[PDB]
Amino acid sequence: SGLVPRRIKPDDNWRWYYDEEHDRMMLDLANGMLFRSRFARKMLTPDAFSPAGFCVDDAALYFSFEEKCRDFNLSKEQKAELVLNALVAIRYLKPQMPKSWHFVSHGEMWVPMPGDAACVWLSDTHEQVNLLVVESGENAALCLLAQPCVVIAGRAMQLGDAIKIMNDRLKPQ
Structure with missing residues (x-):
């Protein structure tokens, strides 16, 4: 907005x-x-x-x-x-509820810190998606979309939208 x-x-x-x-x-x-x-x-x-x-x-x-x-x-x-x-x-x-299904897993979990630039890859396309970590937990990090837009699970998301993500799906940019 x-x-x-x-x-x-x-x-x-x-x-x-x-x-x-x-x-x-x-x-x-x-x-x-x-x-x-x-x-x-x-x-x-x-x-x-x-x-x-x-x-x-x-x-x-x-x-x-x-x-x-x-x-x-x-x-x-x-x-x-x-x-x-x-x-x-x-x-x-x-x-928020932790998400993971639509994202590639990396086996081990990387532990993000607030402020970190982070990435996920979509399971099907392997399209890279850029994220801003805003808070981190032991198993999952609340992130915002750090790109203008992306479509995931058919839903559209815009820059700044929130999504919590399991740590095993996340990598540093």
């Missing part, structure tokens, strides 16, 4: 809010720009529905992920959009 209208530096007037109309978690960038995340009400914890200030912790996350994504094959709007979706996922996303 992205940044509306086509800068971006966190300040104390940044504010998280859920938007009943677009049914999307959002961020007010306090300068006329608004961010519309990928995440609708059905995907958000109850913290999401009371507005909040972007805090130092949120700022640290923004700056860390922004450095992590600086070298991706993505426009600047796309990089900001992926990083901001990452902050929304970390902060407000309900825990």
